[PDB]
Ligand binder design. Structure first.
Ligand SMILES: O=N[O-]
Ligand SMILES: O=N[O-]
Ligand SMILES: O=N[O-]
Ligand SMILES: [Cu+2]
Ligand SMILES: [Cu+2]
Ligand SMILES: [Cu+2]
Ligand SMILES: [Cu+2]
Ligand SMILES: [Cu+2]
Ligand SMILES: [Cu+2]
Lengths: 333, 333, 333
């Protein structure tokens, strides 16, 4: 009986960071309350200044990672302010019934709604907008995120022993399909509604114009590179709501990978590259062993280095020459 | 010695339905006799009235699901009537030797042949036409199906306990490559032979014009929606003979999934979305827990909702508010 | 302390053959020395005489398979002769740190370098060139190979029992993106540097013009078909450095498959087709049971039979009618 359960309000954070949570549950089942505000806005997605009308949960692409435990109840208040122009909803792949909540959450501009569902299956799962007749348009305009449902006793390895992460990051990868004129130049529009027919034509080519992490080319580089120290155990959650991807840590591995993201399955070990199907969230666990810069990419290297699907880690600590060393530096011969 | 084995004649049914069979074998090994008649015909594949010359086993796209047990013998009589125009054959991925039977089954119009093979490996497997020099053309014109080889003691979960399905459906997903004129309009032809050179050009773009379940856009909707009741255990067999797909039940899960379709492997649990590689059949087991409409899609959502890869389930029974409920219905605020 | 370890010099062989090695290690850990010479050269890749400027390790596409054991040290001397025009390096997905060795191996024409790394994870792994700013161009011009790191006690099945192969072949699959003029004819260039801007445009379509095994259409056919005898256990290593593939043995199976190529995981059994993600090497084990011709393909059949991703096995021995037989040969009805 849900009225006797504890309620807890969580304030979400912007990706690639993740709100505070316990790996091993320190309470019994709870009702976990989240609020998300839909925001349609202009977004500059590349170094050339290409602009789209993005459709976001909570102002970001991707939307923020929600974290609960198995058999918690998720209660989401979804707000569509009247500064928006479109009807939106939300589908949780984590949930059972009513098109993942999509049938119960249709909100016009000026409306709100509150949905509750029980998190019966552990794993990372995609959530995305899915309004009838306009599903791929909303999703490929950035309206997707993920939710992690941890087992109550946390993550386990292939032998059933505990795996504890020191840091967690969320990487949302987004395929965009920006419309082009006859010559190949990107088109610009005053409103999202304007772009609609051109967007359908662009999607139907099945060829994205950009593929990005965290909403833009170069978003997870420089000042915004992911950080870690040698010896730290890092969990990287990665989602793609529409299209296959194949993540890879350049200079590293996935020590433990749930490529299709469901924790009741044992992880795959020692992965170089793993396939996350479109419409799925996956998770990879790695212990850093060397300092320096690492790139984290989609290993279709055209998608990575030409279309934008590349981010960086900056890792501090001590170099281990046993693992790798330059015996003779590049020289004439 | 095969002459002392029981023979049983099976009459095939049209997909998405599956002929009657026992999960757990009630007899020893048998010779299972099937007959299939090749039919080239015109097919209307979308709501706009686009027509192709389909190449079918038994008049349907996909061809019908055949069901046997491990170490049964399959004996297929394949008939190519003289109303057809092309040479056809059959390749079973279930079989060992002679290009899956392809080298032994080449039939001109007016010919027939009978092939026998032993079903030595359990799983769901693709079968498809594969005539020398024209393999992708026949396959992408609809000439493919699947065969299920059940273990003699039926399906088992990841712990080795029995999994029994109440209903089974077969979803054949088909990529078509309809040729286009300069402006983007679909071309029409009087005979299959006419389309050949244009078809090669269309295939080489690697970009399907349509992707459909059961031979047409909207085929598994409305009156032809798949049905189930809350509490029923449903097995969905899904094949794609040429191109990757990523099925997903909107509002549900794959409780037990054999994504690459081979039952000696333990299933993957609690899948949201799973990848079936091109040239493979997969299978997903689900117990319905909520009533209502569910969509079953390829979760590249452009492929689903723009190109045609979407079907429906209509599920009857009682709503369970513990799993999901609307706490505050959409309203102003 | 590495100076007390045995050193062994290995001479590499051209794919699809693999240098001599022991499955089960007959020595303790060693430093295994390899030398590779970079060669930029013209390559004819199809039956029409289309030419590209290939960038190769050791003169071949793919580069040669290197074979070591877990916890051996790999010492690679990489030579870039001054007859080349470009800067090259090497990234081993097998290695830990410095972008897989990429940051430590940048060699201009006229330079050499020697890298050492410890092979801490067992599996097959891709290696590829990855120079800063030009990663996909070098990779999709053929500059990739694989390295196998065997467990010290060799391969094991899903029950932990030994699997011993009689033959091993390496199939490198390569996506090429040859630039086209307005009409669709392939362009020719005097130097690699000439093609650069046209190549970027071609890659950005995400649509390969050719997909080949061992560097050319038809390379593994005829005189160059792979061979085996009925009863032999064959390991096929397959890599794709940039793009997904889905291998399939026509008339056979993958009895034991490590689709993502990492031997600490149990194999998948009885696969018809398996997905190797771009940026991965996989391995399939099969025991031949029937003689004759088999085709080994990427089972996107357009990619196989139109774009080039098809090779042959020629298998000798005795036909087994229990497994398959023609009951009634094709005849009028
Ligand atoms: O090793 N990364 O492309
Ligand atoms: O949740 N289906 O797109
Ligand atoms: O059965 N091979 O396409
Ligand atoms: Cu929306
Ligand atoms: Cu979805
Ligand atoms: Cu045919
Ligand atoms: Cu096939
Ligand atoms: Cu290079
Ligand atoms: Cu790489």
């Amino acid at each position: 009986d849900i009225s006797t359960l504890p309620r807890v309000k969580v304030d979400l954070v912007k990706p690639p960071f993740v709100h505070a949570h316990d790996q091993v549950a320190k309470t019994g089942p709870r009702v976990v309350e989240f609020t998300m505000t839909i925001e349609e806005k202009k977004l500059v997605i590349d170094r050339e200044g290409t602009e789209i009308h993005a459709m976001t949960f909570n102002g970001s692409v991707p939307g923020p990672l929600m974290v609960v435990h198995e058999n918690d109840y998720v209660e989401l208040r979804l707000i569509n302010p009247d500064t928006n122009t479109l009807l939106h909803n939300i589908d949780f792949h984590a949930a059972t019934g009513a098109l993942g909540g999509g049938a119960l959450t249709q909100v016009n501009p000026g409306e709100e709604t509150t949905l509750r569902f029980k998190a019966t299956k552990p794993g990372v799962f995609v959530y995305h907008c899915a309004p009838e007749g306009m599903v791929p348009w909303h999703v490929t305009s950035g309206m997707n995120g993920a939710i992690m449902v941890l087992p109550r006793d946390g993550l386990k390895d292939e032998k059933g022993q505990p795996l504890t992460y020191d840091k967690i990051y969320y990487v949302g990868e987004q395929d965009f399909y920006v419309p082009k004129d006859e010559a190949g130049n990107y088109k610009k529009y005053e409103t999202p509604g304007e772009a609609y027919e051109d967007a359908v034509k662009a999607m139907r080519t099945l060829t994205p114009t950009h593929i990005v992490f965290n909403g833009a080319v170069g978003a997870l580089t420089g000042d915004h590179a992911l950080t870690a120290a040698v010896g730290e155990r890092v969990l990287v959650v990665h989602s793609q709501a529409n299209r296959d991807t194949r993540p890879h840590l350049i200079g590293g591995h996935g020590d433990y990978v749930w490529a299709t993201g469901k924790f009741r399955n044992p992880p795959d070990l020692d992965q170089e590259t793993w396939l996350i199907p479109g419409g799925t969230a996956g998770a990879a666990f790695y212990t850093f062993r060397q300092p320096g810069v690492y790139a984290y990419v989609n290993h279709n290297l055209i998608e990575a280095f030409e279309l934008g699907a590349a981010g960086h880690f900056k890792v501090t600590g001590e170099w281990n020459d046993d693992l790798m060393t330059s015996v003779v530096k590049p020289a004439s011969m």
